[PDB]
């Protein structure tokens, strides 16, 4: 898997993308890696934000499916035409597959002005594909048509440029330290998981664990922050504020609306607590924990200045890039489980160490799951 190491790039706050080729002859595009959606969709007309776009009429292997696709999101959208074509990942497995492709012809609030990606690779499951779950996602096609094993793994390493690795079809031992622990994929739609306990510097938050997963918890490379359900966010912020109270911060800092700065290299990392998320384990009544250092949740932005990268959610927990940057994450689709291990590229603390540790004894973990009617 050495050929796939370092196949991801990005810019701060703009996501991670991988190089792909589409069509015959191959058209090279940079594609955002998104575990929180399930469509393969590419700019296919000259939106001013795009470095380049897919030109479907120049591909001899493009097949028009003669069906439109429309994907609304928070008063924005992408829209276009469905087809299939041959797709490869140059720094990936040595195969080519015929996959569904959405050729985006109109959009609002989707592309980012100044980013270096032109499309999105939705790696989640068919249930959340548009227009419906009959549109087979890319990874499903990859596994069906080739001998690539049904798993991939992500090491995201944290404008300043960014990098990482997407290992397609396996695990690279060089990308983590310590042990890999697995949590079940609760259901195949999002990469849904169940958080069973939360601690701040070892202090139990002491909430009904259902609150941690209200109304779901997902692992999402398509989101920057650790996003927490409102009630949990408020409890977490209260605790982090208490821990760090020897310094004063504007109210807006805790809302992610202003920076806090310190003289070069005098950042008081010690006053910010570690956060442990306990995840449902593979065995009955067994859990494990992942521990994130403050270096994960205080995002550097151009003194050393930082933005608070924990935010409130009204649609459940989102373990975004912030969390993922601390860990090598294994999406073991074949066995309906997600693995975590400390990332070989995570940012270290002077005196404390990140961890993925277990086992713990946690009873009635099924009750931590929220039941969306
Ligand atoms: C409902 C739908 C299928 C659209 C998404 C369901 N998923 C979520 O709600 C989780 C968050 C998310 C929202 C998304 C929204 C869209 C979308 C659809 C129509 C119009 C606009 C958008 C958008 C957006 C934001 C986005 N993400 C980033 O720009 C990004 C920024 C920083 C990062 F670190 C990672 C990603 C480009 C996907 C596309 C993919 C998404 N992927 C995601 N994981």
Curated annotation (Swiss-Prot):
DXXLL motif is required for a proper endocytosis and retrograde transport to the trans-Golgi network, as well as for regulation of lysosomal degradation. The transmembrane domain is necessary for its activity. It determines its late Golgi localization and access to its substrate, APP. Its EC number is 3.4.23.46. The chain holds residues 60 to 448 of 501 of the full protein. Induction: Up-regulated by the Ca(2+)-regulated transcription factor NFATC4. This is Beta-secretase 1. GO terms for molecular function: amyloid-beta binding; aspartic-type endopeptidase activity; beta-aspartyl-peptidase activity; endopeptidase activity; enzyme binding; peptidase activity; protein serine/threonine kinase binding. GO terms for cellular component: axon; cell surface; dendrite; early endosome; endoplasmic reticulum lumen; endosome; endosome membrane; Golgi apparatus. The gene is BACE1. It comes from the Eukaryota. GO terms for biological process: amyloid fibril formation; amyloid precursor protein catabolic process; amyloid-beta formation; amyloid-beta metabolic process; cellular response to amyloid-beta; cellular response to copper ion; cellular response to manganese ion; detection of mechanical stimulus involved in sensory perception of pain. Residues 1-373 are extracellular. It comes from Homo sapiens (Human). Keywords: Acetylation, Aspartyl protease, Cell membrane, Cell projection, Cytoplasmic vesicle, Disulfide bond, Endoplasmic reticulum, Endosome, Glycoprotein, Golgi apparatus, Hydrolase, Isopeptide bond, Lipoprotein, Lysosome, Membrane, Palmitate, Phosphoprotein, Protease, Signal, Transmembrane, Transmembrane helix, Ubl conjugation, Zymogen. Residues 16-341 form the Peptidase A1 domain. Inhibited by RTN3 and RTN4. Belongs to the peptidase A1 family.
């Amino acid at each position: 898997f050495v050929e796939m190491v370092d196949n991801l790039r990005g810019k701060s706050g703009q996501g991670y993308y991988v190089e792909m080729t589409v069509g015959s002859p191959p058209q090279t595009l940079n594609i955002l890696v998104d575990t929180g959606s399930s469509n393969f969709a590419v700019g296919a007309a000259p939106h001013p934000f795009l470095h380049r776009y897919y030109q479907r009429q120049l591909s001899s292997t493009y097949r028009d499916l003669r069906k439109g696709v429309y994907v609304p999101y928070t008063q924005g959208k992408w829209e276009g035409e469905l087809g299939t074509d041959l797709v490869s990942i140059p720094h990936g497995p040595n195969v080519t597959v015929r996959a569904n492709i959405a050729a985006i012809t109109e959009s609002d609030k989707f592309f980012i002005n100044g980013s270096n990606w032109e499309g999105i690779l939705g790696l989640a499951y068919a249930e959340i594909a548009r227009p419906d779950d009959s549109l087979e996602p890319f990874f499903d096609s990859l596994v069906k048509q080739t001998h690539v094993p049904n798993l991939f793994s992500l090491q995201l390493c944290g404008l300043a440029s960014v990098g990482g690795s997407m290992i397609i079809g396996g695990i690279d031992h060089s990308l983590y330290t310590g042990s890999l622990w697995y949590t079940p994929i609760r259901r195949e739609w999002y990469y849904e998981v169940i958080i069973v306990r939360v601690e701040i510097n070892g202090q139990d938050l002491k909430m009904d664990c259902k609150e941690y997963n209200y109304d779901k918890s997902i692992v999402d490379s398509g989101t920057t922050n650790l996003r927490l359900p409102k009630k949990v966010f408020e409890a977490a912020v209260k605790s982090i504020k208490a821990a760090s109270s020897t310094e004063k911060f504007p109210d807006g800092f805790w809302l992610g609306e202003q920076l806090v700065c310190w003289q070069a290299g005098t950042t008081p990392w010690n006053i910010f607590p570690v956060i442990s998320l306990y995840l449902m384990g593979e065995v009955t009544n067994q859990s494990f924990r992942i521990t994130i250092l403050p270096q994960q949740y205080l995002r550097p932005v151009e003194d050393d200045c930082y933005k608070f990268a924990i935010s409130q959610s009204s649609t459940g927990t989102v373990m975004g890039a912030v969390i993922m940057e601390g860990f090598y994450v294994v999406f073991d689709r074949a066995r309906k489980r997600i693995g975590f291990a400390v990332s070989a590229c995570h940012v270290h603390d002077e005196f404390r160490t990140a961890a993925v540790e277990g086992p713990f004894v946690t009873l009635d973990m099924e009750d931590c799951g929220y039941n969306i009617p």
